[PDB]
């Protein structure tokens, strides 16, 4: 029915808007019926013809006859080339026409086909019923106290606020020069009157216990009052969807309809500011000072010496094994624990090495979901390579690779990569990492298929379960699964995490 095309990101588009090429838009048409207060525009489109894009293709009379592209009157169903404002589905999106030949979307929630419905009822119901690690770093850099914006920069950023009231706020600094702050700009971005408390990732626990607990010595816990950022640096937990975040609170307070506007304003303003401030990654972000490199090398050497001591003591095997496991399992567990804790300590030291200017730290402190291990591998140590939850097996006769000795249980063999990615991996370490990556690829390949099967089975299990009008949950055959949904008959998207404040305290 439609033409499929690869998706190319376009930040300038709205979150609910899709960029459609004019050729694909003219390829398939949307059917509309003539109305007394739209006859003029439909007449213009049918006069334009099929040769041009914003025209029409077929006309259906009241008798059902189809005419290809001339009088239009009430009851005539004419199919016209889709234009701006139309609704299409792949969730429904608003259509915007763009020059080139690729579909365009914003990547903020996480080759594909599209379809536009013909009747108005389904269009209305899809319309009424239907920031990924990229802007988080620039938001974190934008909310720094160091951010001071000149008058022209402030005006340029302000123009990209769709919800701007048009009143330029007084700058945080008036003399010697009028200097604003990124916090003020994001405060203008924040809609309504949202009050939020959310600790920063860097914020240590000792700040609250000791003094300065809300004067924020290290730009500590984020406080937002009256819908404007009073203080703090906005990391992922304070901005991404979570329990009691800025986006979550704003949504629950006054609507996804303007939470989408919040998303769009954040994206546009942040992109335009980063246009002049700039972000990059390079060699210098992995060249942590010689002190930290020497500390990492010393820790790795100490870990290797400890493993060697464990091996020599196991050769002397006094070493009473732990209960519930044999000698082999116990000593493999000990070696794995030593290697893992050494790797974690080296990674923590490498992360703490980045003081303020390293570009990796900007992603680490904000996007710490799964980037900590990658950064630790890049700078400090790749770490132990495991196969089937165990070290590298003796593929040869009691030997991992022909370059080692028989019955070698040292850190050098069995798949421990002493060097980081910057220093380069030795050929044995390279092969062991290849084995580990192959195992990871196999695991991901099986996991995706199994997860898809589980999802399909689960959605097929209870596809017919619905909440009835008597506030009861019943299946297709009309048996009451629950008298009240969730044992309280209340929706699950309007609830929040709270504390009783009377269960824990003593009498």
């Amino acid at each position: 029915f439609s033409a499929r095309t690869v998706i190319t990101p376009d930040p300038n588009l709205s979150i609910d808007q899709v960029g459609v090429p004019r050729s694909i838009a003219a390829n398939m048409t949307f059917a509309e019926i003539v109305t007394p207060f739209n006859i003029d525009r439909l007449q213009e489109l049918v006069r334009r013809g099929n040769s041009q894009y914003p025209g029409a293709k077929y006309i259906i009379r009241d008798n059902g006859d189809r005419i290809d592209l001339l009088h239009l009157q009430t009851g005539y169903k004419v199919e016209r080339h889709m234009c701006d404002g139309d609704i299409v589905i792949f969730m429904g999106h608003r259509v915007r026409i763009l020059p080139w030949s690729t579909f365009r979307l914003n990547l903020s929630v996480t080759e594909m086909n599209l379809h536009l419905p013909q009747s108005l009822e389904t269009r209305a119901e899809i319309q009424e019923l239907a920031i990924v690690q990229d802007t988080l770093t620039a938001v974190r850099k934008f909310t720094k106290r160091d951010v001071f914006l000149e008058r022209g920069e402030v005006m340029n950023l302000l123009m990209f606020l769709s919800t701007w009231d048009g009143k330029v706020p007084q700058p945080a600094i008036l003399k010697p020069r009028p200097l604003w702050t990124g916090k003020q700009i994001f405060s203008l971005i924040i809609p309504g009157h949202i009050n939020c408390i959310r600790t920063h990732s860097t914020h240590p626990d000792d700040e609250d216990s000791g003094p300065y607990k809300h004067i924020s010595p290290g730009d500590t816990k984020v406080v937002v009052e009256n819908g404007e950022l009073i203080m703090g640096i906005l990391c992922k937990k304070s901005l991404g969807t979570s329990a009691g975040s800025l986006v979550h609170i704003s949504y629950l307070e006054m609507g996804h309809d303007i939470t989408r506007l919040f998303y769009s304003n954040i994206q546009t303003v942040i992109n335009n500011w980063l246009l002049i401030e700039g972000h990059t990654i390079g060699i210098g972000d992995s060249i942590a000072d010689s002190k930290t490199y020497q500390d990492i090398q010393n820790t790795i050497k100490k870990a290797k010496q400890d493993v060697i001591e464990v091996i020599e003591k196991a050769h002397n095997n006094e070493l009473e094994p732990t209960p519930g496991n044999t000698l082999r399992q116990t000593f493999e567990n000990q070696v794995n624990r030593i290697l893992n804790d050494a790797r974690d300590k080296t990674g923590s030291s490498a992360q703490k090495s980045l003081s303020e200017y390293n570009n990796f730290k900007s992603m680490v402190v904000s996007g710490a979901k799964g980037s900590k291990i990658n950064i630790s591998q890049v700078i400090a140590v790749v770490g132990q390579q495991n196969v089937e939850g165990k070290r590298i097996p003796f593929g040869f006769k009691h030997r991992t690779l022909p370059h080692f000795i028989k019955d070698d249980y040292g850190p050098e063999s069995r798949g421990f990569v002493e060097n980081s990615y910057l220093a380069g991996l030795t050929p044995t370490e390279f092969f062991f990492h290849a084995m580990g990556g192959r195992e990871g690829l196999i695991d991901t390949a099986v996991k995706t298929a199994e997860t898809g099967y589980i999802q399909r089975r689960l959605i097929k299990s209870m596809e017919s379960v619905m909440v009835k009008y008597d506030a009861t949950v019943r299946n297709s055959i009309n048996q009451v699964v629950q008298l009240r949904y969730g044992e309280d008959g209340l929706a699950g998207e309007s609830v929040e995490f709270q504390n009783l404040a009377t269960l824990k305290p003593s009498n």
């Binding site: 097929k460 299990s461 209870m462 379960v465 299946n475 699964v481």
Partner: peptide, 22 residues
Amino acid sequence: YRHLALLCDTMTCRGHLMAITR
């Protein structure tokens, strides 16, 4: 917890443990 409760009550309301339709 609402989703988990619904899933558990869906396949325990028959009076006996039932497997998924698959």
